[PDB]
Amino acid sequence: STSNGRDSESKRLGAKRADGQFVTGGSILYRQRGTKIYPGTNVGRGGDDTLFAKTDGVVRFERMGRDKKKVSVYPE
Amino acid sequence: MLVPKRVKYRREFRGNMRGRAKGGTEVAFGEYGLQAVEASWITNRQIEAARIAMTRYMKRGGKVWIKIFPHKSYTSKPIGVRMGKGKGAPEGWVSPVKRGKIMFEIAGVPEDVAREALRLAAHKLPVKTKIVKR
Amino acid sequence: KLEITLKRSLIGRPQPQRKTVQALGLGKTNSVVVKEDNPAIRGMITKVSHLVDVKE
RNA sequence: CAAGUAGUUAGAGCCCGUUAAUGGGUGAUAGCGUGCCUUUUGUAGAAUGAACCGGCGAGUUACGAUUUGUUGCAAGGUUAA
RNA sequence: GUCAUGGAGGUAGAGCACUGUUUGGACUAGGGGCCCGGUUACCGAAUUCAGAUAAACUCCGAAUGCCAUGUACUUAUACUCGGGAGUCAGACUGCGAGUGAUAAGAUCCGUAGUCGAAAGGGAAACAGCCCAGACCACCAGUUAAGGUCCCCAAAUA
RNA sequence: AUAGCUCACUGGUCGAGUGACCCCGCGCCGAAAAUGUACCGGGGCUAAACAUAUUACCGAAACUGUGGAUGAACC
RNA sequence: UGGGGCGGUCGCCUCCUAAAGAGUAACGGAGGCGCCCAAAGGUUCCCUCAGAAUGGAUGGAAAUCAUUCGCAGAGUGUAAAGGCACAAGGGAGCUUGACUGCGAGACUGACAAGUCGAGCAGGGACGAAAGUCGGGCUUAGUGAUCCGGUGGUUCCGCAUGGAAGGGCCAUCGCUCAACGGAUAAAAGCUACCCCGGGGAUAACAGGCUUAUCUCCCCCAAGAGUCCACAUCGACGGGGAGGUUUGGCACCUCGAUGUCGGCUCGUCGCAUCCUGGGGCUGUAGUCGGUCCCAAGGGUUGGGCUGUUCGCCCAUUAAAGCGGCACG
RNA sequence: CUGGUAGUUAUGGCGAGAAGGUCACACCCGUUCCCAUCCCGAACACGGUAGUUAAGCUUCUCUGCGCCAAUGGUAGUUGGGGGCUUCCCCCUGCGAGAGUAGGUCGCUGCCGGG
Numbered sequence A: 001s002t003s004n005g006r007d008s009e010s011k012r013l014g015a016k017r018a019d020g021q022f023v024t025g026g027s028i029l030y031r032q033r034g035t036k037i038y039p040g041t042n043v044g045r046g047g048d049d050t051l052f053a054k055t056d057g058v059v060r061f062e063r064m065g066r067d068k069k070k071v072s073v074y075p076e
Numbered sequence B: 001m002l003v004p005k006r007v008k009y010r011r012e013f014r015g016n017m018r019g020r021a022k023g024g025t026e027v028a029f030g031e032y033g034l035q036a037v038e039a040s041w042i043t044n045r046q047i048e049a050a051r052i053a054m055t056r057y058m059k060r061g062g063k064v065w066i067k068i069f070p071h072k073s074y075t076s077k078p079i080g081v082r083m084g085k086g087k088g089a090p091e092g093w094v095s096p097v098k099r100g101k102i103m104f105e106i107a108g109v110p111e112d113v114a115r116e117a118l119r120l121a122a123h124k125l126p127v128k129t130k131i132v133k134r
Numbered sequence C: 001k002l003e004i005t006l007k008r009s010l011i012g013r014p015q016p017q018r019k020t021v022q023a024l025g026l027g028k029t030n031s032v033v034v035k036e037d038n039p040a041i042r043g044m045i046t047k048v049s050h051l052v053d054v055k056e
Numbered sequence D: 001c002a003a004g005u006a007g008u009u010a011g012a013g014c015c016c017g018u019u020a021a022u023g024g025g026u027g028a029u030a031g032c033g034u035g036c037c038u039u040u041u042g043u044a045g046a047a048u049g050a051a052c053c054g055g056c057g058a059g060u061u062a063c064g065a066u067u068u069g070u071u072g073c074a075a076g077g078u079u080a081a
Numbered sequence E: 001g002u003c004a005u006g007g008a009g010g011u012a013g014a015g016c017a018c019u020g021u022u023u024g025g026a027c028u029a030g031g032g033g034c035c036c037g038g039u040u041a042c043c044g045a046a047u048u049c050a051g052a053u054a055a056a057c058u059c060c061g062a063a064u065g066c067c068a069u070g071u072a073c074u075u076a077u078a079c080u081c082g083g084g085a086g087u088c089a090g091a092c093u094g095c096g097a098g099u100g101a102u103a104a105g106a107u108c109c110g111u112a113g114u115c116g117a118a119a120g121g122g123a124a125a126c127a128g129c130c131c132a133g134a135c136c137a138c139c140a141g142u143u144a145a146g147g148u149c150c151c152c153a154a155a156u157a
Numbered sequence F: 001a002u003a004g005c006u007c008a009c010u011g012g013u014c015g016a017g018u019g020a021c022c023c024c025g026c027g028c029c030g031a032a033a034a035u036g037u038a039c040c041g042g043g044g045c046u047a048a049a050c051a052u053a054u055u056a057c058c059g060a061a062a063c064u065g066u067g068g069a070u071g072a073a074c075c
Numbered sequence G: 001u002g003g004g005g006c007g008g009u010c011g012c013c014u015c016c017u018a019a020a021g022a023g024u025a026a027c028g029g030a031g032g033c034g035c036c037c038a039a040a041g042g043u044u045c046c047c048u049c050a051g052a053a054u055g056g057a058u059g060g061a062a063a064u065c066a067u068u069c070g071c072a073g074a075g076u077g078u079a080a081a082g083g084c085a086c087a088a089g090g091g092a093g094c095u096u097g098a099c100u101g102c103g104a105g106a107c108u109g110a111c112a113a114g115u116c117g118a119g120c121a122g123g124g125a126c127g128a129a130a131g132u133c134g135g136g137c138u139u140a141g142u143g144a145u146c147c148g149g150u151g152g153u154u155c156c157g158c159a160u161g162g163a164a165g166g167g168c169c170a171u172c173g174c175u176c177a178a179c180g181g182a183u184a185a186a187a188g189c190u191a192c193c194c195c196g197g198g199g200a201u202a203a204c205a206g207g208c209u210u211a212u213c214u215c216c217c218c219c220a221a222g223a224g225u226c227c228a229c230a231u232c233g234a235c236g237g238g239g240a241g242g243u244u245u246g247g248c249a250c251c252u253c254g255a256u257g258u259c260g261g262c263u264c265g266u267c268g269c270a271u272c273c274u275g276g277g278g279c280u281g282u283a284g285u286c287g288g289u290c291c292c293a294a295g296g297g298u299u300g301g302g303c304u305g306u307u308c309g310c311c312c313a314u315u316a317a318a319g320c321g322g323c324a325c326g
Numbered sequence H: 001c002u003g004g005u006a007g008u009u010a011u012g013g014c015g016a017g018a019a020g021g022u023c024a025c026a027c028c029c030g031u032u033c034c035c036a037u038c039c040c041g042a043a044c045a046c047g048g049u050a051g052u053u054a055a056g057c058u059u060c061u062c063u064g065c066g067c068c069a070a071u072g073g074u075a076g077u078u079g080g081g082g083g084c085u086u087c088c089c090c091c092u093g094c095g096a097g098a099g100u101a102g103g104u105c106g107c108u109g110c111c112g113g114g
Ligand SMILES: [Mg+2]
Pocket: A008, A009, A010, A011
């Protein structure tokens, strides 16, 4: 009876900083499997595909061509 | 009786029947229709009975269209069984029909026999209906 | 200027309702305040328009 | 001739006279009103306890720790046997 | 709290562009027969025309909710350190789902309210429904839900 | 079966409306249980029911009026 | 744990539920893990899949070549999701960064733990250079402390010199899988049972529900020699009742006595008899079916604890149900 | 006018038709040399200009495929209020998907030659 019943635990993926927020260097901006958001300017892609800020600045969620997105950090 | 040849998943949610019919509100193939006025589940047994009654009256003249199919399956539990310990075993197939949906069409027969055949069929279904033209 | 009177009770109302009324400056029932005619004030009023009476 | 957790609010009639003040006793009639405790999501509860009255009957002391208040001295303070 | 601005996120809805399920028509490459390879409809895979369906489908996609910026207008908290707790049996009602039989005053989650810990007025009586929050005194007034023939205050409007 | 009635139809009397069909509002039947009317609280109601519109009044420990008590914040 | 037992499960990963941020339960719906690779890792250079159509064959539908169409219909060690054709997919050359000491700042989070990380120093691999490299397209592939074993060590060493023994760094020994692990070490019967509690939780009865059950209807193919509706009525559809088998766990565990029979009844009508009627496939006698009707009536025995049921002999008849199965 | 090199969601792509040139760029000719093919000077690399715009390229025309895209209405829905509650209705604000009017055979920057 009930051969099911197992599930993993949630990994708290998503966006950790908002557009237009001042951000300190080295802080995570988006946790995600694969590449839903590409790294833009002054951000880098981590080992498990997270995006982090490589310098202090203001977060900007921008758009590449038709069906892709990217996030970048601009010094004030 | 109409039953799907294969299913990806054996068990399914029951769903709901809010709102008007998404599509099929207008008769397209034949020139007489049997339109649902309210929402209800239609099983394949009722569809078979209605089709048999509709066809027998016309003396197998004209043509019949069935505009619904029992995609969804429903489960049930035996008597004397408590709540819990999994889901039941599937028993039948249903087609959730929303109001405004046309589910039967007839062509090739005059007014009188078409109207009477639709009236005969409508008494086998658990949903209030009405007869429409094209 | 415009006049705000709280005519309905707050018992049974969701939290945003109460927070908006409490931010408008209204206390007990049948209480009156006088504000200005900003877009922000009217934005508050349209949210709790069923609890309040507006006058100039 | 009356359907009552026994009271409370309104109230005539009759009888009194105080720590003297918009006083005392009883109350025809009218409105409203399902005891106390415990345990519970929830008890008038057809869940528990108590017949009634009286006496007795449950967070204390010693030695350590920590924090607040007060007093003395202050880069010092303080003795134990 | 609201306003203006900028974002991330695929629900409701819709749609068939992928994946499953599926109806009618033409052609079906064929299989089996009636046969002398034809007749094929007894089934016909691919293609195409049209019409449907989906919690574990998506070419699309809201309302709300969420994260920020502000110098905008209101409004009174928020945070850190330390002393003291109690709580870890919840209930029903509205809405969104699962299990159940689209049963239960059922069970298990999300969201709001009330009870719990809340008296007062209305539902005859009535924890959870509607109105509304009791500092005390008054033989004063205006209203809420609900009402105005008699019990029973107010329209035989 | 032939029978009896009689249809389609015609000829007359007659003198003005007569047919089906669709939609909406309110009603009727379908309608059965155990102590006693017992599925308006009662009496009772043909409005004292229902629909739309209007105006008065009643109605809470709510809000106000008068007099007292008290907590916090700030002067 | 929709009472306990029997059955199943206990830690980790992926999807739906999950209500467009994160999170979110059920003995809800589906699957995987307790590894593998010395290249299936690093770097430099290069290129592109599945399938179909035609051409010939040993060889056929499918083996290997040739031309065309071909946005991914392939592949990506392995389950699913997210992603990837500027490859993260496929070949070749050289190699071991599958490095040592670290780490501003963040995510997750009760704690213990878990995750990402620019950049700094030492010393390298590939590359002309820019530059990339602290394992694998990304997320599972793993368990604390205590105690022992092995290697190293400008640490201590109970009068002094040594030693025994310890400390520090690196690493090994768990299906401690009941996977935050009670111990180095552990199964059953109780009807002879006892104490503390609970209506937080079951057996009877009540309550809610009505799947099932009893009863009543709708449509009408048909049977009835013809004739759907005298009488039955298939395939389907709609309700009432609260007598059955169930579901739930709301009152009762500081006690609400259980089946059958006896005594005594009372109520409902869905009427067994008697009374009054309509239709008949009602000649008469006898019947069938429906309608009004609760006034009275409704047997004695054999078998079984039996309710029930079968049987014997009667009768106008030998009704069905409720009342804590009165 | 052309060659080279960037930005911009295809309004920029795909397809069909026409024209032009060794000034540039191409196709082209050859393998001694640097270099290369699991074989092949096909490609990569090197060395030259006999021939030709047939192809790339460049320019010009289109709506055939594709892509973009209104207005109006509708579905849905935050807040408030009611029913006969598998669900439905009313008021206010927001407001899609499909369909369509229509647009599109690109638009900008720098360098060198002509
Ligand atoms: Mg997960």
